[PDB]
Ligand binder design. Structure first.
Ligand SMILES: CC(=O)N[C@H]1[C@@H](OP(=O)(O)OP(=O)(O)OC[C@H]2O[C@@H](n3ccc(=O)[nH]c3=O)[C@H](O)[C@@H]2O)O[C@H](C)[C@@H](/N=C/c2c(COP(=O)(O)O)cnc(C)c2O)[C@@H]1O
Ligand SMILES: CC(=O)N[C@H]1[C@@H](OP(=O)(O)OP(=O)(O)OC[C@H]2O[C@@H](n3ccc(=O)[nH]c3=O)[C@H](O)[C@@H]2O)O[C@H](C)[C@@H](/N=C/c2c(COP(=O)(O)O)cnc(C)c2O)[C@@H]1O
Lengths: 385, 385
């Protein structure tokens, strides 16, 4: 393939810091660059607490554990998301209630109110995805969660570098998670950060992350925990990648603006919320789309596996570009159509399914030039007419 | 500290292979060195299947999941072990039944038979620790598990490089796990390998390891999974470390033989099983110990948190050596005395608690010379008389 969605983009101080790790001989999930990695996420996000982990999935698992979610507790979540977001609900055997999205790709604010209202019992938490870097309607969701005493866990796994009203996505919730998996805006080759408001709670996540050891020489355990802690070698990568995070954000936004410029007449590019700044982690576009097709229903279902057919120009577009060795992908297939979540409760308004029909993820690698985006865009244009 | 239990010992091709990873641009939990890492574990262990993961804890979690352990299923396990071994029982909300150890530090064979006999229902699996690299009585345990249709999962997390009757520890069970955490005989700075007999099953673990995706472009999920997959950068480390594994094994055994030579008159060093080869991951020694103190009881309890006092010469020995900047540690404090496992069923014969009293983990780093071991040993001798 010539172009991937969002491959690694390295070329900083990664090797240099890794060599410092080798010199230290802390070849372990702890050490100076774990610490520095967490410092850098605090410096950037302005969250006061950060815990370097091996994945954002782990971060969410810990956020939920530390929030006191138990078996059969209700956890609200975004339907329009990647399964990692909600897999931890399954780990804790909590009961997921999935909620459709709005014009930002994120949980719809009125559906949220509906879903909470109709829970058979007070929901304990909400995992809010910020899909593709886009901010959800935070003042509203935050307030709703405050009003209902719902722990907000922002899943900003795709949204490191996104902002709403000058605040880092991740810093509104009690908890925030960022991914540094291989295709994230920056990477540790696999990694994550759990940030949060409560220093005790984060430090409790920290305790869980290293097998729930009491502070003593022998092994003493009042609870059970995990091995979730991030490798210091990978922490080094994290540090060097954090050095270019903002540069990456700035570039992903340029690439999106380019796509808009080359494809604007023929695709719909939904706007980020005024008073936000999406990291545009992937540039996405909707074909044959009118915003007034949104909210074509308001219902709750028990989920069944559902086959959703791509708009024909999307499936052709994917195939055409694949033949020219350009990776594109459908938008995330809603959890409300997934077999894994058979039986679980979901609120629909039609939107996530409609986005899956008409949407596409475009190559958004920050190593691409304008000319790259240009040649990709004209193959996209060739394909559709 | 001048000497740690088992720090990283690098100095091979680690940086070289990491640089190859950077050149590849697979800065992700997949790629060539993940693959090569798994190949090397197959070449060495002779297991036909290997799955590179971020920890041995993950490996065990997957071994249990894939074995079909469900909530409230009984899982037998070693008491004398590190909590990571049994934490996955907790993840699946299975019911642990812990079993005391014999003169090898591993599950006693008769107690095992007892515990199985008295289970309120057929136990689904057994997680057998091979403590400190030492082989448990495999022909017996294997047979017992076969007879009772118990899935044997060897926890060889500490025993990479150990053998029983010419077979790699890890390759007797349906599943085997190895750790490459920061203090293991070799390291990836955090990592593990799930090996096993059944290629389907291992590949099923593989599927779970990357979020349980159906093989298609869009995201389609019939089940939920994890993010457990190992980083390719760390895989590179694994490959280069696997190149010295046997050398390390050979060295750990030398160091043990040295400790025996310098401390033999004053400590008891229990022998590995004839027709085995322990990796001697840590050199361990028992003070004021007679083998006939073993099996001083045969009872089942419901666990309560129990304070076990070190033999005074052990606690003094630890303090004395700590003051000379040498790390020593007690032996692993049995799960049958841990608060976390309050209420759970445990079979005792006295042995694990007696080993905790009189035992010590000695510095066993493979970078140590004979002179190092010598100077450590005479400080040990100074301390005890
Ligand atoms: C391995 C990887 O990159 N995983 C991310 C990805 O999953 P998936 O689509 O299954 O992965 P693939 O694209 O098949 O993986 C191929 C890898 O090869 C790499 N690559 C390819 C070519 C090359 O030359 N070099 C290279 O390295 C790619 O950049 C990529 O990382 O796509 C998802 C959208 C991401 N989402 C994670 C997520 C979580 C959980 O984060 P966690 O992954 O646990 O940190 C929580 N919530 C939400 C809303 C999330 O979205 C995953 O982190
Ligand atoms: C981080 C680490 O090394 N963890 C291993 C260790 O846990 P713990 O005692 O809490 O760790 P500490 O010694 O406090 O960690 C300090 C780290 O700093 C490193 N270090 C220190 C000085 C230096 O200069 N450089 C340096 O890097 C050390 O080598 C060490 O790795 O000691 C346990 C005995 C190991 N056991 C794991 C296990 C599992 C699960 O394996 P997993 O860890 O999930 O791969 C399943 N079953 C069984 C029977 C197991 O035993 C853990 O893998």
């Amino acid at each position: 393939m010539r172009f991937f969605l969002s491959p690694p983009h390295m070329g900083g101080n990664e090797l240099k810091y890794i060599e410092e790790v080798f010199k230290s001989n802390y070849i372990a999930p702890l050490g100076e660059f774990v610490n520095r990695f967490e410092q850098s996420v605090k410096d950037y996000s302005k969250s006061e607490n950060a815990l370097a982990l091996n994945s954002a999935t782990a971060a969410l698992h810990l956020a939920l554990r530390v929030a006191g979610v138990k078996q059969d507790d209700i956890v609200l979540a975004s339907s329009f998301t990647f399964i990692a977001s909600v897999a931890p609900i399954c780990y804790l055997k909590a009961k997921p209630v999935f909620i459709d999205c709005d014009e930002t790709y994120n949980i719809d604010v009125d559906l949220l109110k509906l879903a909470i209202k109709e829970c058979e019992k007070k929901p304990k938490a909400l995992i809010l995805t910020h899909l593709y870097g886009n901010a959800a309607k935070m003042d509203e969701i935050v307030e709703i969660c405050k009003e209902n005493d719902i722990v907000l866990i922002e899943d900003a796994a795709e949204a490191l570098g996104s902002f709403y009203k000058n605040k880092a996505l991740g810093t509104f919730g009690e908890f925030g998670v960022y991914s540094y998996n291989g295709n994230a805006i920056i990477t540790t080759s696999g990694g994550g950060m759990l940030i949060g408001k409560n220093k005790e709670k984060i430090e409790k996540a920290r305790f869980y992350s290293t097998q729930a050891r009491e502070n003593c020489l022998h092994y003493e355990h009042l609870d059970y925990g995990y091995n979730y802690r991030l490798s210091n070698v990978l922490g080094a990568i994290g540090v060097a990648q954090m050095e270019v995070l903002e540069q990456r954000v700035l570039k992903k936004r340029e690439i999106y603006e380019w796509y808009k410029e080359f494809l604007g007449e023929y695709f719909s590019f939904l706007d980020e919320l005024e008073n936000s700044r999406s990291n545009r982690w992937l540039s996405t576009a909707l074909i044959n789309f009118d915003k007034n097709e949104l909210n074509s229903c308001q219902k709750d279902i028990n989920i069944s596996q559902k086959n959703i057919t791509l708009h024909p120009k999307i499936s052709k577009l994917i195939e055409d570009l694949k033949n020219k060795q350009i990776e594109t992908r459908p938008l995330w297939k809603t959890m409300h159509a997934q077999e894994v979540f058979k039986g679980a409760k979901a609120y629909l308004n039609g939107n996530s399914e409609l986005f899956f029909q008409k949407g596409i993820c475009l190559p958004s690698g920050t190593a691409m030039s304008k000319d790259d985006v240009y040649e990709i865009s004209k193959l996209i244009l060739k394909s559709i007419k």
